[PDB]
């Protein structure tokens, strides 16, 4: 394999982490190859479940624990930290709430969480490296509780930074909030990629393909699919009651992707790097509830 860019794996990593058996398990965790057939079941539907009020109380408590874990792991960014240790106090943390690390075993993905550094799009693994002075990392944090999964994400600086790390990062940030401040009922879903495919365009830099946005509820991914990119075939008019992600993954160069030998690390093909935020967000009769929002705090972990 050529590598793309100056990021390397670095091995071995530690044996899976077990998840003690008084936590409730998504139906892929003891599956072989971590397929889930409750997702595979729905496999090519393009119909949106419309949340009932307990399946409201269920997302709004498993999103409020997964931002709780996130800010744990933002707690912990800094050189010389490995990634592998970050995934240990998210496994922890996630235990320690109750809830199951969704990433672990998700279609065999060795980690519980994702840990996505400079060239890395999205779906890094954790493991022996050192974070970098001049860094940037995505940490993406998904918890499922009592049949909910909840997820997002956000980039953080490592140490200093250069002035095209806190361009890239802050434009991706808006990115999101951009989409996030269209979510309403009678909006179509592909129009979020034309909203966020512009702010991008507008700073220099591209829109990842090959990777969206998803519904996500009783299943971890599940329909609507919601690209990021402008002009996309998205199918589905939003309605109070759906729950769904938007992620946009922006880099620095072209919009290309590749997957390292690993099967789940997704690398920018030139090497340049990628920046990338999630919520899981409620279309409400009116608007949207951001789920994964912090309640304490005006502003993501890089920008304070
Ligand atoms: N949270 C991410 C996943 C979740 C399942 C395993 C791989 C990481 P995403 O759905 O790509 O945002
Ligand atoms: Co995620
Ligand atoms: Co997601
Ligand atoms: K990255």
Redesign the pocket.
């Known amino acids: 394999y050529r590598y793309t860019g100056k990021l390397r794996p670095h091995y071995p990593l530690m044996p899976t982490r077990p998840v003690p058996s008084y936590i409730q398990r998504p139906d892929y965790a003891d599956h072989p190859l971590g397929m889930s057939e409750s997702e595979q079941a729905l496999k090519g539907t393009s119909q949106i479940k419309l949340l009932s009020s307990e399946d409201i109380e269920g997302m709004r408590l498993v999103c409020r624990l997964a931002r709780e874990v996130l800010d744990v792991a933002a707690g912990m960014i800094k050189p010389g930290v490995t990634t592998e240790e970050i995934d240990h106090a998210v496994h922890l943390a996630c235990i320690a709430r109750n809830c199951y690390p969704?990433?672990l075993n998700?279609?065999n993905?060795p980690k519980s969480?994702?840990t996505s550094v400079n060239e890395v799009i999205?779906?890094g693994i954790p493991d022996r490296r050192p974070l970098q002075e001049g860094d940037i990392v995505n940490v993406?944090?998904?918890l499922y509780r009592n049949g909910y999964?909840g997820?997002?994400?956000e980039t953080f600086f490592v140490g200093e930074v250069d002035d095209g790390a806190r361009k890239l990062v802050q434009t991706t940030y808006e990115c999101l909030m951009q989409a996030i401040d269209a979510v309403k009922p009678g909006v179509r879903y592909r129009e979020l990629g034309n909203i966020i495919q512009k702010h991008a365009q507008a700073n220099g830099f591209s829109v990842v393909r090959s990777?969206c946005?998803?519904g996500?509820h009783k299943l971890?991914?599940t329909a609507p699919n919601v690209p990021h990119y402008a002009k996309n075939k998205a199918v589905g008019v939003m309605k109070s009651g759906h729950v769904f992600?938007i992620?946009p993954m922006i880099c620095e160069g072209g919009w290309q992707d590749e997957t390292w030998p690993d099967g789940?690390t997704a690398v920018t093909r030139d090497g340049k790097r990628s920046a990338?935020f999630?919520h899981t967000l409620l279309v409400t009769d009116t608007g949207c509830e951001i789920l994964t929002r912090r309640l304490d705090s005006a502003r993501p972990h890089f920008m304070s």
């Open positions: 969704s990433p998700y279609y993905f969480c994702c999205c779906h993406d944090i998904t999964h997820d997002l994400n990777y946005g998803h996500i971890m991914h992600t992620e789940w990338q999630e």
